[model samples]
Every structure is written in C-alpha cells, then in structure tokens.
Target: HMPRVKLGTQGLEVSKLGFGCMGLSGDYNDALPEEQGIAVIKEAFNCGITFFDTSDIYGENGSNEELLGKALKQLPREKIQVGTKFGIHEIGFSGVKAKGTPDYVRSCCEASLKRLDVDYIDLFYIHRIDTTVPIEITMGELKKLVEEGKIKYVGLSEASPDTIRRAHAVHPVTALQIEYSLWTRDIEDEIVPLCRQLGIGIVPYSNKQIYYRIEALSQKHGCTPVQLALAWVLHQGEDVVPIPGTTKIKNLHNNVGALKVKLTKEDLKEISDAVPANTPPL
Candidate 1:
C-alpha cells in the first residue's frame, strides 16, 4: 500500500499518516519560529502526508491555524486535505468552556475559515462535547453548514460511543477524533468497533505512550520507531489513520517511511502482545 487512505465517508482521501499541527505552535513543546513552523507543514506535504490536523484553540487561539494556513498556501489546495476543529473555548481566565449552540458553531466556523484562509474545510470537528447542549442539536446545526457548502464533513472529538452514534444519526459523522494507540486502547471495547460499524473513520491523536514497544519492533524490522508505530496503525484497519505530530524535518520523513515496513503476521502478533497499557493519570 502507498500509505494513502480516504479520510471519511465524504471521500476526502489522504496519506494514512496525517500530520498534526498542534505542537508546532502551542501548549507542550517549544514553539518554533512562525516561518519554521510553516516550513515544517510544507515539508510534510513533500513527504506525501496529505492530511494535516489543527484546531482553532491551538497556538493561542488562532496562531496554529494561521501557521498552517500560511504553509498550505504554498501548495496546491486540491492536492491536500486540511482538517481543523472548533467548539472548544479559547483559553482565557474562564479556562475552557464548551459550546455547541448553533450560533457558536456558525461563528466558530466563520472564524476558522478566516484563519485557515479557506472557503470550505475538509473536516470540521467539535473539539469537545458540550454537556449543556444535545449532540443531535449540534449535529443538526453542522448539517446545515454541510448543506450550505461551508464544511465537507462533520466530526466529533473526545466523544462517547453514545454521543458518536447519536450525532451520526442526526448527520453522518465523517470522522471520530480520539486517542487510540498501543497503550491507550480504551476505544477498542466500544468506540472503535462502533466507528467501524458506522463507517466513521478513526483519527487517533497521541503516539508517545506506544513508542517504547515501537522502538523494540523497529529494531527487529530495521526501521525508525515512528515508522513502526505508523505502520501498526495502518495495519489496524482501512478505517484507521494515525495523525502523529512532529517538530523536526527528519521525523516527518521517518513517519512517512512507515509505508515501507510491511509487517508479517509474526511482527503484527509480536507488536500486539508486547506492550501493556500505559494509561494516563486522572
């Protein structure tokens, strides 16, 4: 396989290993220079990574989107897939409120479109579920955007199995953005299987927890740790696509090289049984 996959029911195809744009501008890592971050995103495209994920709240509530927008302008838009998120509150003294009102969703989409410098976003996801609002109401509003040609697909992040199924009933959710890896496999019990049944694609966000075993497997396969991890995700199913983020040029190609490592049954079984869960603190 060429490491390429369709992202959702809407037919937004991209490289299986999508590029995440979070760390380049905010939160955990040392923020790169604006130009350097833009360069890294562009480089991902060169590495055959067509899917790039970012959120409105990343990078101080628009910096990350701006960085990705600037980087994507350098490439042909039709050749790439840009997936961005909304719904979560921008950080402030209030410190993360969730909003899913129709007005909030519409306004956020407009702001995101301006920041991303795009007319229509390939995948527009709710960053977090709002307990104050019903999932069907949110999906109903998002469906309006789809009908109006504002966003190609509606998605949900950090949502429950019931929420996913409920929203999909209101509007066919194109993707479910959640954490699923060798270590954080909670979704396997329900969400993963639910998504597979519903045709909603899985776009997992985290990878570090599984890198230890990935390193061991890479030694056996003679590839980089990232290559092994991404290959493992690809092998999970046609519906799974892992979006691993990076800040370095070398690491970007390392991720893309995963397409080169074809795991035999033995390799796959070894990977499955090698690691215990590395669950996070509550």
Candidate 2:
C-alpha cells in the first residue's frame, strides 16, 4: 500500500506492515476453530497485509502454521511472504526452552515447511537462541537451508547483538525479530542500532497484545495504546516491521488501521517522555 522498503536491498518490497498468525491457533490466547482462524488470515490479506509471520510453537506445536498454510493455499504463495521460526524444541507450546542443534535445526525447518506447505521460507528465525548450541552450528544449519532453498532469509529473535553480528558473518541476516513495542521498548538501547549498523532489517513482534481483545487505539488522537505502539515500532526505522498477532476481525481491522497513523515528532516525544525509559509504550 506504501512505497515498500526493501528487506536489506534484497528486493523484497513488502507492505511495511505484517500479520503474525500465532493467535490464530490460540498461542496468543485460546485456540479458535481452524476454519475461523483461516477466515482471519484471509481477512488480513484483504486488508493489505502481505507478510505473515508464524513460528513452530504456535498452537500445540505449529498449529498456527498449519492453519495459515491451508488458508493461504487457495491464493498465490508469492503474493504472501511466509516467515516461520525454528530452533524451539517445545514448538511454541511449553514455556521451557529447547537447545538448537544441527539435526534439530534441520528437523525444525523441515517440519515447519511441511506445516507451512511452502518449499522456501521467505524469512526464518532461530525463535530463541539456545545457549547450549554454539551460534556457529546454528548459523551453519541456516546457511545450509539457504543453499538448499529451504529458506530465502534468516533472522535472530531475542538474541544478543554479539550473536547477531556473529551469525551475519556466517550468513547475511536480513532481519532481526525482537520486542520493541511502545508497550515494551527495552530493545532500543542496543538491538535497533545494532541492526542498522549491520545493514539488517528489524522486525518487532507484538506491537499489540491483540489476544486481549478491545480494539481501543487510545485517546491521544485517532490511535490507541496498541496503535501508538505500532506507530512507535514504525517510527523506529523503515527497516522495522511490527507483526501484531490477532484473531478477531475487528481487531484485525484495527491493526491494519495503524499504517494510516502519522506520529508527529512532538507526538513521539510526548509518548517517549511519558512512558518509563525502558517502556516501549504508554
């Protein structure tokens, strides 16, 4: 809908906005009927959201990916850029984390492909960097996927800047997914600047807690706390795309409405000054 910013000059011109499908399978809350969730996916497309983000842990294990894949199957795959994360052993179910291994990494990507029903993952992330596995081995697996055409781009989520720099050495990381919503802005101190210097893209997950219901944008103007958060994520830089996961059609509509929000320099300053220094939103 807007002059799209390329993902690191890679020539992928996507809508600055993205839709995260974790809530479709209830990862954001409780699971909805697969059909109902599919409807929401279609709804997001209808609203001009071209990039859809999903992780293996969505649902009991990749349930959201399965749901989105089936819904998007009726349409051209290229029209919708698919991003799925790997390296989590619990698969988005358990709170306990899992270590990333070469074999496990391969398996996770393969399984996500099966669930997503896509040969090439447009963007892939480590989900969560496992301390047990050397970042080298993890990067090695991702590089192999890039070679085999199982994935087109790679990213790091909740990873240290050191890890990001080292991974990019192994393979260029197009984007980095981390929390930087107005409601949660602690990442600005390092992740944002680090990505910029590395010539990588920045994607913030959960600009809005869409699973909580109530599509209120806020009283500041035409937007709500969530919308302000989305705007803040956008204001962070052109390289950043916030994927706010949602289920309700109204809330989905409200999420897309964020692109129209224009934050003045003073408006952004007011928000920044009002919220805690570490806070991402009001």
Candidate 3:
C-alpha cells in the first residue's frame, strides 16, 4: 500500500504518489472512452494511489472533472483526495486568461462542485493567479468557502512569491502546484524555499523530456527512464508530491513502480548533476 502523507499543516493527507488525470481526458491525446478512463482510475486506487488530480480546463466543457466524477461514483469517496483547479480561461489558440473576481471565484467553485459531483472538494486550487485582482480579494472568497465547508483546503498554482505570501495571509495555503522536474528547476532558487518556509506542500506537474544521462542511470538501476525520473522527484522531500499523468494502464503501473527505486545521497547527487538545472526541457 502507498504511504499517506500530510500535504500541509491544515490536516489534508494523500497518497505519496498522486495520479494526474489531465492526460486521461485530452491534453496530450484524445480523450479516452468513459469506461476506459474510469478503469484506469480504479486501477490506480487498487494500486494504493488515493490522490487524483484534475483541472477545470483539461477537456472540452469540463469533461475532465465529469470523468473524475463518474469514477468517484464507483470508489469510496471518503478514502480519496480529489484536487481540482479553476481561474484559468482559455482564450483561443493564442493564449489564456485568468479571472479572480470574488463572483467568478464563487461561480467557478460552484460549477466545479457540480461537475465533480461532490458536495465538498478536498483541495481546491486557483489554477492561475489573476494579476488584475488583489490576491487578498481572491483568497477572501476561498476562505469563506473553507469556513462554509465547501472546500477542505485552499491551494495555488503557478503563483509568484509575493502572490503566495499575500494569499497565504488571507488564508492558509495548503499546497502549491507547479511545473517541476529535473529539467525545470527554476523554482529551486526561490519558490521552493518560500513554500518550505510557509509550510505549504509542493505538488509538481511533470514536463516530458529525456536525457541520455537519465537513461543511463535508469539502466544501471534496472528501471525505466520514467520511473527513474519520478524517483528523483520523490527523493526531493517529504513535502513534495509529483503527479504524473498517463492515459494507459500500463504506463500508470510503471509510474507507481517508481516507489521501488531507492536513491542514496550520492546517487541523488549524480542524478542531479546528470541533468543540469539549466537544461532546456524537450
């Protein structure tokens, strides 16, 4: 069974290995059939992964949350920790926009609740920081939702140092989800230390890339490159959790297998050196 760890001091606990649901919907590929997506989720549960991640903008018309909602029907809701996000509005193919008005925040939460088919979301995150609105204003609404039992914990994704501190001041920020991997270590110089200082847990969403050094290390450890990469993140700290998403059951199992790959301090250093922090992601 996967070990359960606390994300933050606010009493939110989840499996050490979380399953990212983005790819299952339609980010990297076409959305899987409903039954197939649900089956993959169930398989993760069977493998002891109780932490599942999704976002409002993952699929067309919020189908990602709907998919998770259907899968939740067959699983024990109490035993699972579902984390979803809001505030990111896609603006055609060019780019995206962020909205954090109090009204928009409340409306997004309500709609996500309906789409997820849950009375209370375990962890609700602001998908992106809306620079136009004051962080305090956005967090004030989230604090109200926490008090009303609409959401268990508050989180932020892709937020800057000032924004994180400002939002945490309004209410305790439970987690910070961001793009992190060996190839992308830009957060190490600042965001990582800030989150540690604030006692906010870090949930890393991986970027796809490969290096010959990583492949060589995996070969030496008798594991696949994917497992090796995940193991590196796992070795970072107890407060860190990486959510690697996949659409296939085989790949999901491979991701969970990362738990078996142990890295000594020297091995960790070697792996870290193998892929310099400045290396561009593929």
Candidate 4:
C-alpha cells in the first residue's frame, strides 16, 4: 500500500506508520538489546518505514540514539529519514526524565551527531519546554543550528500555544508532537487550530485511545485494538503523524496493517457510538 500521508510544504509523503524507539533500550517492561533494535530498524526500513522518532535521552540518556544510529548507518541516508530530540537527560544514555537546558542541548546535539554518525538531523525537537528558558531563546538556538546546517527543521513537544507562537515568531516550527488521542482532544480546542494557522504539521503522540470500544471494533473488523487505535488516529486528519512504539514484529505489522483498513461511513458511525472513553477526563 501507499504511505500514510505527506507533510512538509514541499509535500513529502512518508510512511504513516512510524516506529518509536523510546523503549528500544528502556520504557517497555523488558527493553530489547541494541542488536534487536538494529534488527528492528533495518526491518522497518525494508518495510518502507521512512520516519523514525527517537530522542537523545531515550536509552540511558544517549544509548538509544547510539543504537538507532548504528541501525540506520547500514542504509543510505536518503533511503530513511529519522527524527530525534535534544533536550531532557536524566540518568545514563537511557534517561528521558531529565530537563532541558541550552548548554545541555548543544551537548546533546553534538553527542547525537557523533552517535548517529551524521552531519545533520532531518528533524530535531525540543523534548521539554524547560520552563526557565524562554521558548524564544530555545527556539532561537535551534534556528542558529539550522543556519549552521546542523538541523533541517525545528520542532517542539508538549509546548503551549503561546510558547509556540513566541517561538514561531523567532523561527518557524516545522512540527509539534503532543499527547493526542481519541480521549485526549485537548489539542482540538487550541493547539491544532494554532498549528494550522501557523502552517505547522502535527505529530501526535499516543493517538491510541485505550478503550473497550477498540476491542469491539477490532472484533468486528478482524483487527486488534492496537490497529483500531492507529486507524482512529489517522481518521482524524491528514496533517497529524502518529508513531506507535512496539518492539514486537507482530504488533508492528498489525499496526502497519491499519494503513490498509479503509473505514466506511458506517464503520465510523459504529465506532463513534461505541467508544465512550472520550467524555471522561483524559
């Protein structure tokens, strides 16, 4: 099947299904080894997964990027495009609980560049707002790197609309990753409109709204809740990108299968009627 959808003003279409490697070295109950991660990366690329969202602090702080870099290095850069974050480091290479600092950002970038063995990153996001540092200052720093040929585009994660506006004024933001799901419609009220207004593409995290309705839908469609969740996210809009991280190849294939499960109007109606998880606090 064709890719999920296209983004970038130039209109580059990529695989709608992305492989999140946050748990590649940690996050999951049992994190996979670097060798396994490399296998997943190579398999994903072979399966036409062009987009990979990783962070400098994913595995013990920097290990994830290093592992992902190793996995990606086997192929030509043109064949796959990977996205990673720079801010927030806590423990070792597997740390993602850390905070964001400008100095730390530079360090993270340099380290990531070293690990990925690349001159530049395709897409780089500020993992956290850092609150202390004004978004303008943070985004401005990223802008400088863009001029230096270190980053291709600027992105923000879990940022406020006002912060986004302020940062955009300083430097154009290419994308924003927020925790959005059928249950978490917070973005619909403000962030989404603002992004469209500012011409920024959305990369929504956790689009899979966990609910019993997913089980029901999965049963009827011969798909699983996981597949329905991914499909539901895609059903929202074309501009939003959803990455469901899973180390298991079966689950990964099932999620990718959602790209082919075209929903009928009746199917949409049935889902709406069944999934009552939206009204409760998300």
Task: Give me the candidate number with maximum lDDT.
Answer: 3
Q: Where does candidate 1 have its weakest 10-residue lDDT segment?
A: 273-282
Q: Per-residue lDDT of 1-282 in model 2, one digit per residue for the tens?
A: 643667665555567888888877874555588887888888888888788888888787677788888987876788888888876665435665766788888888899889888778888888888776668778889999988989888877888877887788888888888777655877778777888888888888772444322243246457766666677678777888888888899888877777778878877776665555110111
Q: Is candidate 2 or candidate 4 better by lDDT?
A: 2
Candidate 3's residue-wise lDDT over 92-185, tens digit each?
6767788888898899989989999999999999998777788888899999999999999998998888888888888999999988888788
lDDT score of model 2? 0.77
lDDT of each: 0.82, 0.77, 0.88, 0.74
Off by over 4 Å in 1: 27-30, 90-95, 207-216, 277-282
What TM-score, over all chains together, does every model reach?
0.90, 0.87, 0.94, 0.86
Query: What's the count of clashing pairs in each model shown?
Result: 0, 11, 0, 13
Query: 140, model 2: CA deviation in Å?
Result: 1.0
Report RMSD (Å) for each prediction in the order shown: 4.8, 6.1, 4.9, 5.6
lDDT at 65 for candidate 1? 92
For candidate 4, the TM-score is: 0.86
Ranking by lDDT: 3, 1, 2, 4
Which regions in candidate 3 have their CA more than 4 angstroms from the true location? 27-30, 207-210, 277-282
For model 4, what is the error of residue 78's alpha carbon versus the real structure, in angstroms, after optimal superposition?
A: 1.8
Per-residue CA lDDT of model 1 for 1-282, tens digit only, reads 346777667777877788899989956555688887888888888777888899998887598998888887889887878899888875579777788889999999999889989888988999988877888888888999999989988778988877887888889988889887765778888888888888899999975656666687789898886677667777888888888898988887787787788888788879877777111111
Model 2: ten consecutive residues of lowest lDDT? 273-282
